From a paper:
Addressing the elusive specificity of cysteine cathepsins, which in contrast to caspases and trypsin-like proteases lack strict specificity determining P1 pocket, calls for innovative approaches.
Two peptide fragments, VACK and TAHE, were the exceptions because their main chain ran into the S3 binding area. The MPD molecules were bound to the primed site region.
Residue numbers in the entry:
A (entry chain BA): 222 to 442
B (entry chain PB): 452 to 455
C (entry chain AA): 1 to 221
D (entry chain PA): 444 to 447
Write the structure that this text describes.
């Protein structure tokens, strides 16, 4: 496997978005992974509608601004036959009535693939060979809210009790040794002003820190 | 009611 | 016109590039605009060669790593009959021998269109109806060099004496009022690590701040 | 020239 990967340099990743005051990170994580797989299939990078997921996937078990799951979102895209572009179905950060239109769909999936749970080397292999991967993490600590730079390591982090969906767009290492100070490159949905211009480096191969490899998945297109 |  | 525009979300913009220690930002602005118009024309996003412009457009009045103009670059692509891809004519950030190869050409233009000088509304109409637009700006300040987030505003900026070519990929606003806190979304060529993932928000409709609407243009494909 |  490569010593490092950054899918942003290859055209797979849309700009940093902002979920605002809505518990919809699961939808941002799902659109981020679907954006990368649709780009790998067609060569076109098109922002997808998180609002379409918030408003329309209650039947699949999501709860809009009250939380949800990236896999239920990929299940909704499969059962619905499509997902609208962000341009056609804009984000307003509140739960609203479904307004999906097939004429505005720009993405499809046939289901999803789960990465082996808890295995960071399985995750590293999926990040290197598939593209960005949806993951859940424990972001329930003030250190994550106030993160600015460097490798994030929170001693109180849980690898089992997760509360936030994010997108792994790569991995790498600080310093000149490829095996020391490793990290996962993560796209958050709290806007570009949070963290490292919207991104965070989470410590890698340090016992599944913050649960990054506990519930990872990607859509099949 | 999982991830937010 | 739309309240906001962001061509990155529609597939028109390549990942941020880095001119390094060469005064070629005019060539990156020009390839960025041509990348968007070729994508509007064919549906395919193909990275274009700045080095081809640096090495070959001296007859049109450019001076390679010593500076140049986006309009002179669009004139070269017209007179030359084509422009090579980034992959086939790689960037090395120094003046080299012209190695233009017609068989590697992936773009063409018939000339270019100019936005009315100094008119921010004319520039807004061009960004909304055409795609990314080449523009010149006054970037000669340490506040720009160390810009990291938010709307950039510099009291010492000039709207007349400009020194750096960049690309307007959209515009928007902060908050709920679509007026107030308006900004231009600008792609730079100092690498993804500079600014906000390689981008800067420049204050919009504030008397043509930093000259963004003084010398704007786009290729005709 | 100009833009750099
Ligand atoms: Cl999930
Ligand atoms: Cl020019």
């Amino acid at each position: 496997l490569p010593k490092s990967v950054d899918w942003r340099k290859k055209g797979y990743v849309t700009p940093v978005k902002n979920q605002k005051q809505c518990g919809s990170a699961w939808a941002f994580s799902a659109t981020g992974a679907l954006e990368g797989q649709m780009f790998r299939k067609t060569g076109k990078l098109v922002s997808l509608s998180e609002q379409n997921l918030v408003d329309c996937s209650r039947p699949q078990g999501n709860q809009g601004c009250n939380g949800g799951f990236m896999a239920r979102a990929f299940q909704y895209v499969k059962e619905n036959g499509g997902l609208d572009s962000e341009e056609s179905y804009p984000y307003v950060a509140v739960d609203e009535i479904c307004k999906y239109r097939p004429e505005n769909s720009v993405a499809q999936d046939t289901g999803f693939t789960v990465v082996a749970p808890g295995k960071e080397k399985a995750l590293m292999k999926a990040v290197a060979t598939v593209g960005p991967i949806s993951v859940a993490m424990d972001a329930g600590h003030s250190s994550f809210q106030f993160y600015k730079s460097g490798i994030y390591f929170e001693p109180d982090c849980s690898s089992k009790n997760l509360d936030h969906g994010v997108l792994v767009v790569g991995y790498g290492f600080e310093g000149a040794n490829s095996q020391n100070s490793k990290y996962w490159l993560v796209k958050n949905s709290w806007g570009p002003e949070w963290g490292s211009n919207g991104y965070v480096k989470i410590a890698k191969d340090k016992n599944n820190h913050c649960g990054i490899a506990t519930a990872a998945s990607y859509p099949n297109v | 009611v999982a991830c937010k």
